């Protein structure tokens, strides 16, 4: 179950928790998480590595 | 209590074998298929 | 008493307003709620929102148009095979990529995996029609 | 032909999703559901 | 049982989504969480 939760988190964002699982690229997910905290997403794409 | 804290999803997923995650390296919390208990090594330290 | 305090918090959040806490007011995206009274208990009906009918799309994080990277304002770039569109995050609705839909930030050599395309402003056809 | 059986639990259906670095699933339809909850 | 209800709430909010409650999911602005199993318990790794 723990492995399933980790799989869903790292491949689907939070969208699997409310309905059907949708794949999404991982740094795109990180961009949405910065948009969650009031940071504009272009901060991430300049500084990824 | 154990069921209501863990049983939250109704499909069992799996990560793809390719690790093209843009630079992130989740090698320490992913399960390790070289062990009879398919656990991450963090879980192994927790159990030891 | 512990159950009663939990039910009180459920009424004070899920019913009198909209909560963003996932799986606090039922499974899905929460919209609203109604209470009903039962002998020594309460029964909530949560009205929630669940999407369906998903499709496959190719994406790109940014667009280098004139040497400048455009980032989508709210939503995501998608491509259906031939063109590029901006859509929001939870309903498929394509639009033409505008100056109104993106904004300019930095130079397009740093971001990994940018995709060349065009950006339509309404202002050049507006000027050239009068020209 | 009815009788009593014993079995190992099945946790749930296995479901592998096609992850890539450049693919996004976007919903098109939606449903409004009502769920009950008793306290 | 009280502590287990707290754990289930933390699993449902910190892991499955992104909460805006300050210091619910660890110190700092919350980004995400990963769970790990443990003997009779769970261990969250909050990324902030
Ligand atoms: C992926 C791709 O084709 N990138 C091109 C680049 O090769 C070219 O030098 C530049 C000049 O406009 O435009 C862009
Ligand atoms: C992840 O980190 C471990 C620890 O050094 C390393 O052995 C492994 O090769 C890394 N994986 C990748 C894909 O870089
Ligand atoms: C997206 O495409 C892949 C392979 O092209 C396929 O396996 C997958 O089922 C598609 N997604 C959907 C929702 O059909
Ligand atoms: C995605 O992975 C493929 C693997 O073949 C790689 O060639 C491609 O460069 C990756 N995409 C980006 C944007 O780097």
SS3 assignment, position C102 = strand
Taking Cα atoms as reference points, which of A43, A14, E5 lies closest to residue C9?
E5
Q: What is d(CA C29, CA E10) in angstroms, rounded to the nearest whole number? A: 18
Three-state secondary-structure class, residue A12: helix
Structure tokens at C91: 């309903």
Touching, D vs E (3+ Cβ pairs under 8 A)? no
- Return left, alpha or beta for C33; rule: phi > 0 is left, psi -120 to 50 is alpha, else beta: beta
Residue of E nearest to A35 (CA): E31
What kind of experiment solved this structure? cryo-EM
Q: Give the residue among C107, C117, C52, C58 at the shortest CA–CA distance from C87.
A: C58
Nearest C-alpha in A relative to C54: A22
Report the pocket of ligand 4 as residue ranges, CB < 6 Å: B 20; C 112-113; D 21-22
Would the CB of B25 count as within 6 Å of ligand 2? yes
Find the length of chain C: 131
Cβ-based burial of B19 (10 A; exposed 0-12, middle 13-18, buried ≥19): exposed
CA nearest C86: which of C73, C100, C97? C97
> Within an 8 Å CB–CB cutoff, is residue A28 touching chain C?
yes
Phi-psi region of B39 (alpha: psi -120 to 50; beta: other; left: phi over 0): beta
Smallest CA-to-CA distance from C57 within D13, D18, B7 is with D18
CA A7 to ligand 4 center in whole angstroms: 21
Pairing between β-strand D13-14 and β-strand B11-12 as defined by DSSP bridges: parallel
Q: Is A33 on the interface with E (CB under 8 A)?
A: yes
What resolution in angstroms, rounded to 1 decimal?
3.9
Per-residue DSSP letter, E14? I
Total count of residues recorded for chain E? 48
Contact between C75 and C88 under an 8 Å Cβ cutoff? The reply is yes
Q: Considering only residues 28 to 87 of chain C, which have any Cβ-Cβ distance to chain A shorter than 8 Å? A: 28-29, 50-52, 54, 59, 61-62, 69, 71, 76
E42: which 2 tokens? 């769970």
Q: In which residue are the tokens 């079995």 written?
A: D7
At C64, list the tokens: 């280098």
C53 touches ligand 3 (CB under 6 Å): no
Q: Are C78 and C40 in contact (CB under 8 A)?
A: no
Burial class (CB in 10 A: 0-12, 13-18, 19+), C122: exposed
Angstrom CA distances, C37 to C1, C25, C32, C41, D39, stand at 18, 17, 17, 6, 10
What's the rounded Cα separation, in Å, for the pair E19 and B27? 26
Owner of token pair 């980790």: A6
> CB–CB of B6/A1 below 8 Å?
yes
User: Can you list the alpha helix ranges (DSSP code H) found in C1-131?
Assistant: 2-10, 123-130
Closest ligand (CA of B25): 2
Place of tokens 């609203």: C32
User: How far is the alpha carbon of A49 from chain E, nearest alpha carbon, in Å?
Assistant: 17
Give CA–CA dist B29/E15, Å, rounded: 14
Q: Which residues of C touch D34 (CB under 8 A)?
A: 45-48
C-alpha B15/C-alpha D16 separation (Å) is: 7
Query: Are E15 and A5 within 8 A, CB to CB?
Result: yes
The residue to mutate among C56, C58, C59, having the most atoms of ligand 3 within 8 angstroms of its beta carbon, is: C56
- Cβ distance A25 to D22 less than 8 Å, yes or no, reads yes
Check: CB of residue D19 under 8 Å from CB of residue A11.
Answer: yes
Contact E7 B5 (CB under 8 A): yes
């Amino acid at each position: 179950y723990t492995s399933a939760l980790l799989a869903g988190t790292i491949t689907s964002g939070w969208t699997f928790g409310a309905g059907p699982a949708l794949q999404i690229p991982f740094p795109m997910q990180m961009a949405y998480r910065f948009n969650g905290i009031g940071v504009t997403q272009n901060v991430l794409y300049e500084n990824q590595k | 209590n154990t069921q209501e804290v863990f049983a939250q999803v109704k499909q069992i997923y799996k990560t793809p074998p390719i690790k093209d995650f843009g630079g992130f390296n989740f090698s320490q919390i992913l399960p390790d298929p070289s062990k009879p208990s398919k656990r991450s090594p963090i879980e192994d330290l927790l159990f030891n | 008493r512990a159950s009663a305090n939990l039910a009180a918090t459920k009424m004070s959040e899920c019913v009198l307003g909209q909560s963003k806490r996932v799986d606090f007011c039922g499974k899905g995206y929460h919209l609203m709620s109604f209470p009903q009274s039962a002998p020594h208990g309460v029964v909530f009906l949560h009205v929630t929102y669940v999407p369906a009918q998903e499709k496959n799309f190719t994406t790109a994080p940014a667009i280098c148009h004139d040497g400048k990277a455009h980032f989508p304002r709210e939503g995501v770039f998608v491509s259906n095979g031939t063109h590029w569109f901006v859509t929001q995050r939870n309903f498929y609705e394509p639009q033409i990529i505008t100056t109104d839909n993106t904004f300019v930030s930095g130079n397009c050599d740093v971001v990994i995996g940018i995709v060349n395309n065009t950006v339509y402003d309404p202002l050049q056809p507006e000027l050239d029609s009068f020209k | 032909s009815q009788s009593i059986i014993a079995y190992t639990m099945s946790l749930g259906a296995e479901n592998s999703v096609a992850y890539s670095n450049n693919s996004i699933a976007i919903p098109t339809n939606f449903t409004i559901s009502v769920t009950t909850e008793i306290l």
